Amino acid sequence: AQYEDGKQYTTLEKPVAGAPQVLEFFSFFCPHCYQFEEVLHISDNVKKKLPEGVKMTKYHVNFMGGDLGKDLTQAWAVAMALGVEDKVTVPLFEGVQKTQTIRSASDIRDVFINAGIKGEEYDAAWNSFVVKSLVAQQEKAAADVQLRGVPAMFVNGKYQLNPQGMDTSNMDVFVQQYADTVKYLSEK
Ligand SMILES: Cc1nc(CCN(C)C(=O)Cc2ccc(Oc3ccc(C#N)c(C)c3)cc2)no1
């Protein structure tokens, strides 16, 4: 077969019922997640190859970066609650991994302020039980797959992308192989 279990993807032995159709996990501490966002734009190219009848979900993980890792998962919840993912994703990556100016929750907050979210607005969201449940949603989804590594993408709670099984001599070719695989899996 052109697409094969163990090549472009693997099959979960305990599939997750009711999961999001297309679910990616990332960490702002994760070097490959940095590439996936700024250099490869994986999420955008996957969306361009799915129909407008499929929802895409992106969740942060706790297991990288200790205390600041958990702050960033809550900050991602704030970003999702306020709908400002596209405004804060790049400054958070660059602040953690490029300039290394994100060292505390206050520094994360500064990113949002500089991106234009009001201080009262950030703080009220940060402390809300709506954000508390968005944090719980991110944890529950990663725990359903005993997630131990990022970047990760899962399709219909049944299949996990296997980027190590694709060709990386060319960055655009890799991105389109990856996105075509998500499409094939979504249609499965
Ligand atoms: C099995 C399995 N374990 C995981 C997650 C583990 N974990 C920390 C990784 O790092 C895995 C990973 C992701 C992408 C990748 O391929 C790349 C990365 C960067 C660039 C760039 N620029 C290109 C072109 C391809 C290689 C490895 N997932 O599945």
XYZ file of N, CA and C and ligand atoms in Angstrom:
593
model
N 0.837 -1.186 0.000
C 0.000 0.000 0.000
C 0.881 1.247 0.000
N 0.349 2.346 -0.532
C 1.106 3.594 -0.534
C 1.166 4.200 0.864
N 0.057 4.155 1.596
C 0.005 4.532 3.003
C -0.070 3.253 3.827
N 0.781 3.143 4.847
C 0.913 1.901 5.597
C 1.072 2.175 7.082
N 0.387 1.368 7.882
C 0.554 1.382 9.329
C 2.018 1.151 9.690
N 2.600 2.088 10.433
C 4.006 2.023 10.763
C 4.915 2.791 9.832
N 4.379 3.385 8.768
C 5.194 4.195 7.873
C 4.881 5.672 8.069
N 3.826 6.167 7.421
C 3.426 7.555 7.611
C 2.592 7.754 8.862
N 2.137 6.673 9.489
C 1.280 6.776 10.657
C 1.362 5.472 11.430
N 0.936 5.534 12.683
C 0.774 4.352 13.509
C -0.670 4.284 13.987
N -1.080 3.099 14.412
C -2.446 2.863 14.852
C -2.450 2.641 16.357
N -3.252 3.428 17.073
C -3.377 3.239 18.512
C -4.083 1.921 18.794
N -3.543 1.159 19.747
C -4.140 -0.121 20.104
C -5.352 0.050 21.008
N -5.405 1.140 21.775
C -6.579 1.512 22.562
C -7.089 2.834 22.005
N -8.002 2.805 21.037
C -8.467 4.056 20.426
C -9.351 4.848 21.374
N -9.372 6.163 21.166
C -10.036 7.102 22.065
C -11.378 7.490 21.459
N -12.461 7.167 22.161
C -13.800 7.466 21.674
C -14.121 8.944 21.851
N -14.807 9.512 20.858
C -15.280 10.882 20.927
C -14.216 11.952 20.861
N -12.994 11.606 20.465
C -11.910 12.572 20.421
C -12.132 13.590 19.301
N -11.444 14.735 19.358
C -11.473 15.660 18.219
C -10.975 14.981 16.953
N -11.556 15.383 15.821
C -11.228 14.755 14.545
C -9.744 14.891 14.226
N -9.206 16.101 14.348
C -7.795 16.373 14.095
C -7.261 17.106 15.316
N -6.371 16.455 16.054
C -5.931 16.935 17.357
C -4.411 16.940 17.384
N -3.802 18.123 17.472
C -2.356 18.203 17.611
C -1.976 18.687 19.005
N -0.838 18.195 19.482
C -0.262 18.628 20.745
C 1.090 19.265 20.484
N 1.422 20.269 21.290
C 2.693 20.943 21.117
C 3.140 21.485 22.471
N 4.380 21.956 22.510
C 4.898 22.687 23.657
C 5.713 23.864 23.148
N 5.584 25.018 23.804
C 6.448 26.139 23.437
C 7.916 25.878 23.765
N 8.215 24.836 24.553
C 9.584 24.408 24.833
C 10.142 23.433 23.803
N 9.321 22.969 22.878
C 9.680 21.853 22.011
C 10.344 22.355 20.733
N 11.618 22.037 20.491
C 12.297 22.583 19.305
C 11.650 22.220 17.981
N 11.151 20.990 17.835
C 10.502 20.653 16.576
C 9.161 21.350 16.439
N 8.467 21.594 17.553
C 7.236 22.373 17.481
C 7.509 23.783 16.979
N 8.665 24.339 17.334
C 9.062 25.634 16.791
C 9.129 25.587 15.267
N 9.837 24.589 14.723
C 9.884 24.401 13.274
C 8.486 24.207 12.701
N 7.674 23.374 13.355
C 6.339 23.081 12.842
C 5.517 24.355 12.698
N 5.739 25.323 13.590
C 4.996 26.575 13.536
C 5.640 27.576 12.578
N 6.868 28.027 12.879
C 7.417 29.175 12.161
C 7.975 28.831 10.788
N 8.542 27.643 10.611
C 9.248 27.313 9.380
C 8.379 26.505 8.419
N 7.619 25.539 8.942
C 6.843 24.596 8.139
C 5.360 24.928 8.068
N 4.822 25.618 9.074
C 3.417 26.022 9.101
C 2.506 24.813 8.895
N 2.775 23.767 9.685
C 2.103 22.475 9.522
C 0.597 22.615 9.714
N 0.177 23.287 10.789
C -1.253 23.398 11.071
C -1.997 24.061 9.925
N -1.421 25.123 9.355
C -2.101 25.824 8.276
C -2.183 24.965 7.019
N -1.136 24.194 6.727
C -1.155 23.403 5.504
C -2.054 22.181 5.636
N -2.186 21.628 6.843
C -3.176 20.575 7.064
C -4.583 21.111 6.818
N -4.906 22.264 7.413
C -6.238 22.843 7.241
C -6.563 23.062 5.773
N -5.576 23.498 4.989
C -5.809 23.757 3.575
C -6.152 22.490 2.794
N -5.824 21.307 3.317
C -6.115 20.052 2.629
C -7.284 19.288 3.240
N -7.818 19.743 4.358
C -9.045 19.156 4.871
C -10.247 19.904 4.318
N -11.409 19.260 4.257
C -12.636 19.991 3.923
C -13.008 20.965 5.032
N -13.940 21.862 4.707
C -14.476 22.778 5.708
C -15.587 22.094 6.497
N -15.472 20.779 6.673
C -16.380 20.018 7.507
C -15.636 19.259 8.588
N -14.390 19.656 8.834
C -13.528 19.024 9.826
C -12.988 20.108 10.751
N -13.063 19.863 12.058
C -12.548 20.787 13.059
C -11.124 20.405 13.440
N -10.290 21.418 13.661
C -8.906 21.222 14.069
C -8.724 21.758 15.480
N -8.067 20.967 16.322
C -7.844 21.306 17.717
C -6.351 21.242 18.019
N -5.861 22.215 18.782
C -4.444 22.282 19.124
C -4.312 22.558 20.612
N -3.586 21.687 21.312
C -3.487 21.736 22.761
C -2.021 21.775 23.187
N -1.751 22.501 24.266
C -0.424 22.567 24.863
C -0.267 21.437 25.878
N 0.988 21.064 26.161
C 1.267 19.976 27.094
C 2.126 20.476 28.253
N 2.056 19.729 29.361
C 2.714 20.082 30.615
C 4.102 19.476 30.777
N 4.410 18.384 30.078
C 5.566 17.585 30.472
C 6.904 18.174 30.040
N 6.930 19.338 29.402
C 8.185 20.024 29.121
C 8.207 21.350 29.864
N 9.344 21.663 30.469
C 9.528 22.973 31.071
C 9.035 23.129 32.490
N 8.704 22.036 33.173
C 8.371 22.106 34.588
C 7.286 23.113 34.909
N 7.567 23.978 35.893
C 6.582 24.957 36.358
C 6.134 25.900 35.241
N 7.079 26.391 34.436
C 6.719 27.262 33.320
C 5.954 26.501 32.238
N 6.223 25.207 32.082
C 5.433 24.424 31.148
C 3.955 24.446 31.489
N 3.632 24.331 32.781
C 2.238 24.359 33.217
C 1.638 25.748 33.093
N 2.430 26.789 33.372
C 1.960 28.148 33.135
C 1.574 28.333 31.676
N 2.370 27.768 30.763
C 2.107 27.956 29.345
C 0.860 27.209 28.907
N 0.550 26.087 29.555
C -0.699 25.394 29.243
C -1.898 26.226 29.679
N -1.797 26.878 30.841
C -2.862 27.777 31.264
C -2.943 28.991 30.345
N -1.784 29.529 29.933
C -1.773 30.668 29.019
C -2.386 30.309 27.672
N -2.131 29.088 27.184
C -2.780 28.628 25.958
C -4.293 28.540 26.145
N -4.741 28.076 27.318
C -6.170 28.104 27.628
C -6.719 29.524 27.553
N -6.003 30.495 28.138
C -6.414 31.893 28.010
C -6.503 32.284 26.542
N -5.456 31.967 25.771
C -5.446 32.262 24.340
C -6.651 31.654 23.622
N -6.996 30.401 23.946
C -8.148 29.770 23.297
C -9.455 30.414 23.748
N -9.570 30.721 25.042
C -10.788 31.345 25.548
C -11.030 32.699 24.890
N -9.968 33.491 24.707
C -10.075 34.824 24.121
C -9.994 34.817 22.602
N -9.638 33.688 21.998
C -9.526 33.601 20.552
C -8.335 34.330 19.963
N -7.201 34.347 20.667
C -6.056 35.135 20.225
C -4.837 34.257 19.963
N -5.062 32.983 19.622
C -3.961 32.064 19.325
C -3.035 32.618 18.251
N -3.612 33.166 17.181
C -2.813 33.664 16.069
C -1.984 34.886 16.446
N -2.336 35.575 17.531
C -1.611 36.768 17.947
C -0.467 36.472 18.904
N -0.508 35.347 19.615
C 0.459 35.073 20.672
C 1.354 33.884 20.382
N 1.021 33.037 19.399
C 1.802 31.822 19.170
C 3.261 32.144 18.866
N 3.503 33.041 17.918
C 4.873 33.335 17.502
C 5.639 34.045 18.621
N 5.109 35.097 19.254
C 5.888 35.714 20.344
C 6.172 34.762 21.494
N 5.316 33.765 21.736
C 5.586 32.833 22.827
C 6.709 31.871 22.460
N 6.662 31.306 21.250
C 7.775 30.492 20.767
C 9.085 31.262 20.833
N 9.104 32.471 20.269
C 10.355 33.214 20.211
C 10.809 33.635 21.603
N 9.870 33.982 22.480
C 10.245 34.338 23.838
C 10.791 33.179 24.650
N 10.276 31.961 24.428
C 10.815 30.799 25.129
C 12.142 30.358 24.518
N 12.202 30.224 23.190
C 13.314 29.530 22.540
C 14.297 30.425 21.796
N 13.885 31.601 21.317
C 14.812 32.454 20.572
C 15.476 33.493 21.469
N 14.690 34.406 22.036
C 15.250 35.438 22.905
C 15.415 34.957 24.333
N 14.692 33.903 24.714
C 14.729 33.363 26.068
C 14.455 34.461 27.092
N 13.410 35.239 26.813
C 12.933 36.299 27.688
C 11.691 35.902 28.469
N 11.180 34.692 28.265
C 10.029 34.193 29.005
C 10.579 33.285 30.100
N 10.565 33.770 31.343
C 11.125 33.046 32.474
C 10.140 32.899 33.624
N 8.935 33.440 33.491
C 7.979 33.494 34.586
C 6.612 33.754 33.980
N 5.576 33.565 34.797
C 4.223 33.836 34.325
C 4.063 35.300 33.935
N 4.731 36.206 34.660
C 4.662 37.622 34.305
C 5.160 37.862 32.884
N 6.264 37.214 32.501
C 6.785 37.360 31.143
C 5.793 36.850 30.101
N 5.104 35.746 30.393
C 4.069 35.277 29.473
C 2.980 36.329 29.336
N 2.549 36.891 30.472
C 1.529 37.931 30.453
C 1.962 39.113 29.589
N 3.248 39.486 29.659
C 3.755 40.611 28.866
C 3.537 40.379 27.373
N 3.726 39.138 26.920
C 3.500 38.800 25.512
C 2.077 39.162 25.107
N 1.100 38.777 25.933
C -0.298 39.074 25.624
C -0.565 40.573 25.620
N -0.014 41.294 26.606
C -0.154 42.751 26.658
C 0.442 43.389 25.414
N 1.651 42.966 25.048
C 2.280 43.493 23.844
C 1.484 43.111 22.601
N 0.868 41.924 22.597
C -0.018 41.552 21.501
C -1.341 42.306 21.527
N -1.649 43.029 22.603
C -2.798 43.912 22.631
C -3.980 43.463 23.469
N -3.850 42.388 24.230
C -4.909 41.968 25.140
C -4.817 42.828 26.393
N -5.950 43.381 26.829
C -5.967 44.225 28.019
C -5.552 43.441 29.262
N -4.868 44.138 30.175
C -4.421 43.501 31.404
C -5.570 42.958 32.229
N -6.606 43.780 32.439
C -7.796 43.303 33.134
C -8.399 42.093 32.432
N -8.310 42.052 31.104
C -8.901 40.975 30.318
C -8.093 39.691 30.440
N -6.768 39.799 30.330
C -5.898 38.650 30.553
C -6.088 38.070 31.950
N -6.050 38.928 32.969
C -6.076 38.453 34.348
C -7.408 37.800 34.696
N -8.519 38.380 34.236
C -9.822 37.786 34.509
C -9.937 36.416 33.850
N -9.451 36.293 32.615
C -9.466 34.996 31.944
C -8.567 33.998 32.667
N -7.330 34.408 32.968
C -6.375 33.543 33.659
C -6.991 32.884 34.889
N -7.803 33.626 35.637
C -8.347 33.149 36.900
C -9.740 32.545 36.771
N -10.274 32.433 35.560
C -11.650 31.993 35.384
C -11.760 30.472 35.426
N -12.912 29.993 35.900
C -13.183 28.562 35.853
C -13.410 28.067 34.431
N -13.746 28.960 33.496
C -13.787 28.562 32.093
C -12.395 28.169 31.616
N -11.374 28.936 32.006
C -10.008 28.574 31.639
C -9.551 27.346 32.423
N -9.970 27.227 33.690
C -9.701 26.008 34.454
C -10.184 24.756 33.718
N -11.359 24.823 33.088
C -11.870 23.638 32.398
C -11.197 23.435 31.046
N -10.754 24.519 30.397
C -9.948 24.381 29.187
C -8.599 23.742 29.489
N -8.002 24.072 30.642
C -6.791 23.377 31.075
C -7.077 21.891 31.279
N -8.180 21.574 31.963
C -8.538 20.175 32.182
C -8.755 19.450 30.860
N -9.346 20.134 29.874
C -9.560 19.521 28.565
C -8.238 19.183 27.895
N -7.248 20.070 28.019
C -5.958 19.814 27.392
C -5.257 18.637 28.052
N -5.334 18.557 29.382
C -4.720 17.456 30.111
C -5.405 16.131 29.784
N -6.739 16.131 29.778
C -7.486 14.900 29.545
C -7.192 14.333 28.162
N -7.052 15.207 27.162
C -6.819 14.734 25.802
C -5.437 14.104 25.667
N -4.422 14.706 26.295
C -3.086 14.121 26.244
C -3.019 12.832 27.051
N -3.744 12.775 28.169
C -3.723 11.577 29.000
C -4.430 10.411 28.326
N -5.415 10.691 27.468
C -6.101 9.624 26.747
C -5.161 8.837 25.839
N -4.036 9.419 25.427
C -3.088 8.734 24.558
C -1.736 8.536 25.244
N -1.693 8.675 26.573
C -0.458 8.546 27.351
C 0.681 9.299 26.667
N 0.385 10.537 26.289
C 1.260 11.308 25.422
C 2.599 11.573 26.096
N 3.687 11.162 25.439
C 5.026 11.350 25.976
C 5.933 12.164 25.066
N 5.449 12.619 23.918
C 6.288 13.392 23.021
C 5.476 14.312 22.137
N 6.055 15.469 21.845
C 5.478 16.426 20.902
C 6.554 16.772 19.882
N 6.169 17.293 18.705
C 4.826 17.531 18.184
C 4.128 16.201 17.920
N 2.815 16.169 18.103
C 2.040 14.964 17.848
C 0.720 15.358 17.212
N 0.249 14.541 16.275
C -1.066 14.761 15.704
C -1.800 13.430 15.662
N -3.074 13.461 16.043
C -3.924 12.280 16.096
C -5.167 12.539 15.262
N -5.621 11.523 14.531
C -6.774 11.676 13.657
C -7.852 10.716 14.142
N -8.996 11.278 14.557
C -10.181 10.520 14.973
C -9.883 9.567 16.128
N -8.994 9.982 17.027
C -8.632 9.158 18.165
C -8.072 7.785 17.837
N -7.766 7.533 16.567
C -7.334 6.210 16.136
C -5.935 6.166 15.540
N -5.461 7.241 14.908
C -4.201 7.202 14.180
C -3.301 8.343 14.625
N -2.001 8.068 14.707
C -1.013 9.065 15.099
C -0.035 9.267 13.953
N 0.181 10.528 13.582
C 1.107 10.852 12.506
C 2.511 10.381 12.862
N 3.264 9.953 11.850
C 4.619 9.438 12.032
C 5.578 10.214 11.136
N 5.899 11.461 11.501
C 6.772 12.285 10.640
C 8.160 11.702 10.420
N 8.676 10.909 11.361
C 9.954 10.238 11.135
C 9.898 9.265 9.963
N 8.701 8.919 9.490
C 8.556 8.025 8.355
C 8.304 8.743 7.041
N 8.665 10.024 6.975
C 8.545 10.836 5.773
C 9.922 11.361 5.374
N 10.003 11.926 4.169
C 11.268 12.410 3.626
C 11.471 13.879 3.982
N 12.687 14.218 4.419
C 12.967 15.551 4.943
C 14.110 16.249 4.213
N 14.481 15.775 3.022
C 15.459 16.507 2.225
C 14.905 17.849 1.768
N 13.582 17.953 1.661
C 12.899 19.136 1.161
C 11.774 19.463 2.131
N 11.741 20.703 2.605
C 10.808 21.056 3.669
C 9.378 21.155 3.162
N 9.195 21.643 1.937
C 7.852 21.736 1.384
C 7.297 20.352 1.080
N 8.138 19.467 0.543
C 7.711 18.103 0.241
C 7.281 17.390 1.515
N 8.019 17.594 2.610
C 7.639 16.994 3.887
C 6.273 17.497 4.346
N 6.059 18.814 4.289
C 4.791 19.397 4.730
C 3.635 18.828 3.910
N 3.815 18.689 2.602
C 2.685 18.210 1.814
C 2.463 16.710 1.995
N 3.529 15.936 2.215
C 3.357 14.533 2.585
C 2.602 14.402 3.901
N 2.967 15.226 4.882
C 2.300 15.235 6.178
C 0.817 15.576 6.034
N 0.511 16.659 5.310
C -0.879 17.086 5.163
C -1.687 16.091 4.342
N -1.094 15.544 3.282
C -1.796 14.531 2.501
C -2.087 13.304 3.347
N -1.208 12.999 4.306
C -1.445 11.847 5.172
C -2.601 12.108 6.126
N -2.670 13.316 6.697
C -3.811 13.669 7.543
C -5.110 13.537 6.757
N -5.118 14.037 5.514
C -6.306 13.921 4.668
C -6.681 12.462 4.451
N -5.709 11.637 4.051
C -5.994 10.220 3.830
C -6.545 9.579 5.093
N -5.968 9.923 6.249
C -6.442 9.351 7.502
C -7.836 9.857 7.839
N -8.101 11.143 7.591
C -9.423 11.689 7.885
C -10.504 11.015 7.052
N -10.179 10.620 5.820
C -11.135 9.961 4.936
C -11.261 8.466 5.200
N -10.426 7.912 6.070
C -10.379 6.474 6.309
C -11.684 5.968 6.901
C 6.881 8.098 17.171
C 6.754 9.565 17.505
N 7.274 10.282 18.514
C 6.801 11.647 18.316
C 7.171 12.810 19.253
C 8.652 12.837 19.837
N 9.620 14.000 19.585
C 10.183 14.721 20.728
C 9.970 14.352 18.212
O 10.752 15.284 18.069
C 9.439 13.642 16.939
C 9.515 14.287 15.554
C 8.674 15.173 14.891
C 8.923 15.653 13.588
C 10.046 15.273 12.848
O 10.337 15.714 11.561
C 10.776 16.985 11.199
C 11.132 17.898 12.210
C 11.573 19.171 11.868
C 11.661 19.533 10.525
C 12.116 20.847 10.251
N 12.491 21.927 10.038
C 11.318 18.669 9.476
C 11.430 19.112 8.044
C 10.876 17.394 9.855
C 10.906 14.376 13.493
C 10.634 13.920 14.779
N 6.033 11.661 17.197
O 5.995 10.409 16.700
